[model samples]
Target: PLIVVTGLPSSGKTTRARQLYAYLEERIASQYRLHYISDATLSISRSVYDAHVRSANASEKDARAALYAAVKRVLGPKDIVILDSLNYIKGWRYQLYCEAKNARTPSCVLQVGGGVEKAREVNERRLERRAESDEEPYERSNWENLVFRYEEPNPMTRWDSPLFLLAWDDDEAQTRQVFDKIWDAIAG
Candidate 1:
């Protein structure tokens, strides 16, 4: 089964996904494993860029397709895949649902919510740390641009299948709930 974790950057999606991955890994045997896939890889993002080497259009759908293809290649018969991405667009998520359904695997969405200011604050903090110590660091300006372009998922969308809306502050309870869901989904 595929568990797609989506939300805005710095909204704690990665943190919660990491926590859930650990929990799922502990309960499942070695043969049935969990894999983490991110959408920011060059191959996926480059698909959105045109001849000028700039983004011709910000198409999350194209990115999602690339990611889905990558996941399908890595997945085994009984493997559990977890995708970490900023799946903000509704149409893109719907496409992902179709891909998972075609694969005959169950899929779910876990969305993290937070105020724009709070998210920006977290983004800035991360950028500051990355800039000082990391080789490839994101600039503060990028965070500003991300906030301007971000789209939130529509809760009413049909492709949202088994959606879980979680607040960024409720990490502990939300983490536990997600783990329980994973345990039930994978153990069956």
Candidate 2:
């Protein structure tokens, strides 16, 4: 099965992703190998996000190509593939859904929902962290542009159906409940 995680910049998608991965690891250990695909895993630079619109588009397309290639190489029924990324575009999600179909496996979307104000604050906090640390500062304009470009997943859409909505404040119990639902949907 394939799990696609989507959210705005600095909305804790990666945090939740790690949690979900560990949860699955505990249950599926030794039976199946889990694959976590992300920009970092693919060696794609996050700086591409700070480029101008045209350059960003080109860079993003190349990044997706690399991501897709990796997914294609590893996706399978016995294995679980978790995509940890912005995945903010509906069309790209549709393309991923198609790949799942081609692979003869189920696919689902996890939409990490958070307030725009909260995301903005988190973005600012990360920028401040970069000032004192080794991290790169996320450009405000690019951050806003990506947020504006994000297309919310509609559960009604076939490619995005069985969509799971997770809020920023959801506690451990709530997250585990969602994880169980996801596990059943894909593994049952």
Task: Give the candidate number with the greatest lDDT.
Answer: 2
Candidate 1, residue 146: lDDT: 60
Model 2: how large is the Cα RMSD against the reference? 3.4
Which residue window of length 10 is worst by lDDT in model 1?
A: 130-139
Best model number under TM-score? 2
Instruction: Candidate 1: list runs displaced more than 4 Å.
Output: 40-62, 130-142, 182-188
RMSD, candidate 1, Å: 4.4
TM-scores of all candidate predictions against the true structure = 0.74, 0.89
lDDT of each: 0.66, 0.83
Model 1 Cα lDDT, one tens digit per residue, 1-188: 77777765567666677777787777775357678787554234422422447665766556666787877876544778887777766676777777677777777787775767787777677657641121222355655566567666655765776777677677687767766775575444
* Residue-level lDDT for 164 in candidate 2: 92
Which whole-number lDDT from 0 to 100 does residue 101 have in model 1? 73
RMSD of each: 4.4, 3.4
